[PDB]
């Protein structure tokens, strides 16, 4: 089964550069073309450039000249994206797509994982884990909302569960946002009101990178 | 460059249904070697894109009969002959006939359901928080549809948007809707200046901004 293996998330402050790694397993990156696509959060698809791995031969998209080096070592069967002097605009996803054949037999087209590059100058940060608990009381036979606030961490990830997983209808987790180098992330539950104070809910935050294991419980105002 | 421009941006879609997404190039993308580039490929969440379609209408190997593609040199249509739920997702077109490659903005295929009201709820700071010297205003805006929504932040009666964070959730897999939270940061010095905090939501659900408010001194 033919793989294409690219490097683990990559963490890099501006002004330096970074070099992501596809590793081909199962074919020869020299019968192929590499493609690399440059996706940002929350945005569409972004063509970087080619490279014939065989010849030496590339192509880059004009934006990438300059930031972009592609390059290829075949006897490790890797082709390797450099990003250079970077900034926050070069927070993204990277993938590699190995492609060819499409005049002279079946078309190949495989892809990458994706590699994630985050552009900050944070050391590794534990979070703070604050307790949302609603600002007044709930009517009869109602639904309550309560929160879970995780800010001032860095890197990615971290996790949260309520009631140690235990709780896991009407619960929603946002997406971390890094804003000033470190990151925000929110989780609500959604619980009937008799069962709220009434019961302990408590939210669960892990964060592997510093250690930290928080559970804070949500008590009334 | 060769710009490729999709429509529509968003398709919301029954199971079942037919589904046509089109794509525009600025220019011919026919090659002088007389091949057509023009691929289409889905992308779903936390995954990279898959090829369909190549050289307009030629279904990749694997690809499900339902997917068919058609075009001249440059109106391009990608059609899905009856929707699944696998299916769901982003789409985008793809020229590779001229350098730079360029992909179209991409085209949300998503399941269409009924309108659902936001619920909207508003936390002020915690007191663990307010020790550590910040204050955060949560306001959580749940299980809402149509996607289309707007969130504001008044401090006594006032925009604010500086230290205003949003984040979001895709459609959920059960019950078709999407979430989103906006927490407004403030410094604890701030926060304790004024006294009314407000965050509102336009959405179809309502001909109103949809509000939630609390008062810092109770
Ligand atoms: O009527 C039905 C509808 O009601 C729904 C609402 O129900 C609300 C009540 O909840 C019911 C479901 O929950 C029942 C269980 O409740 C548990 C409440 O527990 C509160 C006390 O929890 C304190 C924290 O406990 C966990 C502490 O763990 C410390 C060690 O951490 C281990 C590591 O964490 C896991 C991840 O790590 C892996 C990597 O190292
Ligand atoms: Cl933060
Ligand atoms: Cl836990
Ligand atoms: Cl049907
Ligand atoms: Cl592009
Ligand atoms: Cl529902
Ligand atoms: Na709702």
């Known amino acids: 089964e033919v793989q294409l293996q690219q490097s683990g998330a990559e963490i890099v402050r501006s002004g330096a550069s970074v070099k992501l790694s596809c590793a081909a397993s199962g074919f020869n990156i020299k019968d192929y073309y590499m493609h690399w696509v440059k996706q940002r959060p929350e945005q569409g698809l972004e063509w970087i450039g080619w490279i014939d791995p065989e010849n030496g031969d590339i192509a880059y998209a ?24 970077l900034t926050s605009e070069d927070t993204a996803v990277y993938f590699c797509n190995g492609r060819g054949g499409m005049i002279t037999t079946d078309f190949f087209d495989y892809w990458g994982q994706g590699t994630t590059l985050t552009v900050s100058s944070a050391k590794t940060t534990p979070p703070s884990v604050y307790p949302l608990a609603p600002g007044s009381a709930a009517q ?28 896991s209808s009407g619960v929603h987790t946002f997406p971390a946002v890094l804003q000033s180098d470190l990151y925000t992330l929110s989780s609500s539950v959604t619980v009937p009101s008799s069962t709220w104070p009434s019961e302990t809910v408590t939210c669960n935050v892990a964060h592997p990178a510093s250690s930290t294991k928080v559970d804070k419980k949500i008590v009334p105002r | ?19 046509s997404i089109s794509c ?19 992308q779903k969440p936390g995954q990279s894109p898959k090829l369909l379609i190549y050289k307009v ?30 299916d769901l997702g982003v789409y985008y077109c793809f020229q590779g006939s001229h350098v730079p490659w360029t992909f179209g903005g991409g085209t949300k295929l998503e399941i269409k359901r009924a309108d659902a009201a936001p619920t909207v709820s508003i936390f002020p700071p915690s007191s663990e928080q307010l020790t550590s010297g910040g204050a955060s205003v949560v306001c959580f805006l749940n299980n809402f549809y149509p996607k289309d929504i707007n969130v504001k932040w008044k401090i006594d009666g006032s925009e604010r948007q500086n230290g205003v964070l949003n984040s979001w959730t895709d459609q959920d897999s ?33 001909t109103s901004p949809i509000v939630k408010s609390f008062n810092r001194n109770e």
């Open chain 1, 62 to 85: 004009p934006k990438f000249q300059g930031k972009a080096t592609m390059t290829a070592d075949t006897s490790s069967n890797t082709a390797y994206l450099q990003l250079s002097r």
């Open chain 1, 140 to 167: 009869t036979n109602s639904m309550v909302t309560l929160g879970c606030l995780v800010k001032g961490y860095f890197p990615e990830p971290v996790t949260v569960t309520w009631n140690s997983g235990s709780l």
């Open chain 2, 1 to 19: 460059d060769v710009l490729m421009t999709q429509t529509p941006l968003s398709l919301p879609v029954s199971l079942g249904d037919q589904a």
């Open chain 2, 24 to 42: 525009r190039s600025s220019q011919s993308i026919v090659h002088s070697n007389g091949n057509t580039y023009l691929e289409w490929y889905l």
């Open chain 2, 57 to 86: 209408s030629n279904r990749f190997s694997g690809v499900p009969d339902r997917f068919s593609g058609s075009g001249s040199g440059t109106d391009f249509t990608l059609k899905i002959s009856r929707v699944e739920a696998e």
């Open chain 2, 174 to 206: 059960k019950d078709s809707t999407y979430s989103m939270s906006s927490t407004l940061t403030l410094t604890k010095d701030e926060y304790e200046r004024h006294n009314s905090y407000t965050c509102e939501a336009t959405h179809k659900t309502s």
